[PDB]
Amino acid sequence: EPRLILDQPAQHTNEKDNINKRYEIRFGKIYLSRPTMTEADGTTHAMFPQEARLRNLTYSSPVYLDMEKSMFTSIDGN
């Protein structure tokens, strides 16, 4: 499901003005990083399974998704 579209065809409190204003969210590349743990202070550092076992953390990796916000006007995010 790569796209999510919200559309306003015309007559959006307009005096019979037609403009297809669409905002689209497009899903792109998925980025996976090495397992990193963020301290309660705010600092982040690389985590290893021994530290997760001792500190009762969860060995996990953050995942980044590229959603791009495309603006469409033609009458017819990192």
Partner 1 sequence: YLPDGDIDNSIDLSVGSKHFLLGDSVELSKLDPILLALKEIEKESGAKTKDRIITWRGIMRKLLTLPYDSEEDFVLDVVSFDGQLFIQFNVPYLKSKDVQKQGDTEFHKKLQFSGYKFEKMATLPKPWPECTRKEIDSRAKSKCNNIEQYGAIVRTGISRIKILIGGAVACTADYYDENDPLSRYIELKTTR
In angstroms, the Cα distances linking 74 to 9, 16, 48, 68, 71 are 10, 16, 52, 19, 10
Given the complex with partner 1, which of 13 and 73 has the nearer CB atom? 13
Smallest gap, in angstroms, from Cβ of residue 10 to partner 1? Answer: 10
Look-up of token digits 């090495």: 34
Given the complex with partner 1, which of 14 and 61 has the nearer CB atom? 14
Given the complex with partner 1, which of 12 and 69 has the nearer CB atom? 12
- How many Å apart are CA 42 and CA 51, to the nearest integer? 18
Smallest gap, in angstroms, from Cβ of residue 11 to partner 1? Answer: 6
